[PDB]
């Protein structure tokens, strides 16, 4: 069990850790989050009481270092940082626990939600999507744009998701125009899986990470990427059986976890109706299809 301490909480802010969140009052004595499960990525995120715009936060993995949060009054936000003095850090962490000024990561033991949402997400891959290689953790916020969005301005702050585009030379073999456009198996399996992602797990990892960024920060370009990667699978006639069964589980927990009130902007009617009901894989997402009908039948 690992800990992320906070130096202080100078401004009123809603703090989230993974799918949980807590309201912290201005200069309330809050000094971190303990009992964070080792073995998964995590994200700590923030939304200031005074600006319900720009949700922001940090992806990290506690096996990669000792991390903590400090408010910066110049840049006006809670910054994640790394403490390299391991002794000095256990010291801070032990005094804050003894004084009991830390919340405990509130995992029910029956609950595999976070595992299911992050099964294929790896810190090393996140750091290639969010390039900032002097930090071991990754900053993301509501307004960051993706590489694809940029192409249609500041590349230091871009989400370098893999560009997917169904009407591109990459996607369409010359001479198989119609075949490849109507059956994206070529694009999925040869270009993307064998070519770029190398294996299905890295593909799923980006898909899950895109979803989480859309859910936690309302990052619109991430929602575009999550939908694109679903559609590419559902629009392929030939998909490894293990990917379909796994996709059904991935999507199920994503749909389960979305806040009920956000179905409008986060869920693309066209993609879902096409995937669940028109695509080659209409019959391969039984759990996802069942939870979508019983929770958001309006969209469909």
């Amino acid at each position: 069990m690992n800990t992320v301490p906070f130096t202080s909480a100078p401004i009123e802010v809603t703090i989230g850790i993974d799918q949980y969140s807590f309201n912290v009052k201005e200069n309330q004595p809050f000094h971190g989050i303990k009992d964070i499960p080792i073995g998964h990525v995590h994200v700590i995120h923030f939304q200031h009481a005074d600006n319900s715009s720009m949700r922001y936060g940090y992806w990290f993995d506690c096996r990669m270092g000792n991390f903590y949060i400090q408010y910066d009054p110049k840049d006006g936000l809670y910054k994640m940082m790394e403490e390299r003095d391991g002794a000095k850090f256990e010291n801070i962490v032990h005094n804050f626990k003894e004084r009991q000024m830390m919340v405990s990561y509130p995992k029910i033991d029956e609950d595999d939600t976070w595992y299911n949402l992050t099964e294929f997400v790896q810190m090393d891959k996140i750091r290639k999507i969010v390039r900032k290689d002097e930090n071991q953790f990754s900053y993301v916020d509501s307004s960051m744009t993706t590489v694809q969005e940029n192409e249609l301005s500041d590349p230091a702050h871009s989400l370098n998701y893999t560009v997917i585009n169904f009407k591109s030379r990459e996607a369409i073999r010359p001479g198989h125009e119609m075949e490849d456009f109507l059956d994206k198996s070529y694009y999925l399996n040869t270009v993307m899986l064998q070519g770029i992602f190398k294996n299905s797990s890295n593909y799923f990892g980006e898909l899950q990470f895109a979803f989480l960024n859309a859910m936690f920060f309302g990052n619109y370009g991430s929602s575009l990427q999550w939908h694109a990667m679903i559609e590419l699978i559902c629009s392929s006639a030939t998909v490894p059986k293990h990917m379909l069964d796994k996709l059904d589980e991935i999507l199920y927990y994503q749909i389960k976890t979305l806040p009920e009130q956000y179905s409008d902007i986060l869920l693309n009617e066209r993609v879902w109706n096409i995937c669940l009901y028109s695509s080659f894989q209409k019959n391969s997402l039984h759990n996802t299809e069942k939870i979508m009908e019983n929770k958001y039948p309006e969209l469909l």
């Binding site: 009407k167 030379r169 369409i172 125009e177 119609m178 456009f181």
Partner: protein, 237 residues
């Protein structure tokens, strides 16, 4: 963006553009089989690719052999249209390639867009105009060359005959679309109007009769009158 009444004069500027109409690419007759079921028989069709500024028509004849052993032919027809249009552009020298291609049916955008991926600077556009180019097979010489073909064939025409020697492209296109609107609404009458006077002939290298200027005014009035009548008949107005 889409082409409509507002930006209608863009058709006659000096940017090369082509209309593509696919309505007559996949043509069937519907009939009863011996056991009483319905079956189709394909007949020869054509892609109607037209430069509205110059009159140059690229009539690509689609031979029934294209369909042999193929499923979902109505869908395939869109991709074969896009294939042939793309091949036509490739065959044209660079300075003759269009800057825009306007498809008369929106279902053609994705097939053509995909086939034109090698020409990113050629814009593929839909139109809100309700153009009458499906009536192209009502022009006797076009219908004849399509039905007689024994293999795929590109036949070139000027759909304006020699009109541009005396009128502008705008007026020429308005005349063409009026003639075709008429032929579409009531072919028998439209054609009666065009040939009533046997002393007005069609040159061997033309599609339409060699009307004098004054006779074209009378023709166009007669075609307008036809189109209005049929409308009151259609809607009881």
């Amino acid at each position: 963006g889409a082409m409509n009444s507002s930006n209608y004069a863009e058709l006659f500027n000096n940017d090369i553009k082509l209309f593509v109409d696919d309505t007559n690419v996949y043509r069937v007759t519907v009939h009863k089989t011996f056991e009483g079921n319905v079956a189709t028989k394909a007949i020869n069709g054509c892609i109607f690719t037209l430069n509205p500024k110059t009159g140059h028509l690229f009539l690509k004849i689609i031979h029934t052999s294209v369909w042999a052993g193929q499923k979902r032919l109505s869908q395939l027809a869109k991709w074969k249209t896009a294939e042939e249009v793309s091949a036509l552009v490739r065959s044209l020298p660079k300075e003759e390639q269009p800057k825009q291609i306007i498809v008369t049916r929106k279902a053609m955008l994705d097939p053509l867009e995909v086939h034109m991926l090698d020409f990113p600077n050629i814009a593929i556009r839909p139109t809100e105009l309700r153009l009458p180019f499906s009536a192209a097979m009502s022009i006797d010489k076009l219908s004849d060359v399509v039905m007689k073909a024994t293999e795929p064939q590109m036949v070139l025409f000027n759909i304006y005959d020699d009109w541009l020697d005396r009128i502008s492209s705008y007026t020429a296109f308005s005349r063409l679309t009026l003639l075709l609107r008429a032929l579409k609404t009531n072919e028998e009458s439209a054609k009666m109007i065009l040939l009533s006077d046997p002393t007005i002939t069609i040159k061997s290298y033309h599609l339409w009769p060699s009307f004098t200027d004054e006779q074209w005014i009378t023709i166009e009035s007669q075609m307008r009158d036809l189109i209005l009548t049929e409308y009151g008949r259609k809607y009881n107005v």
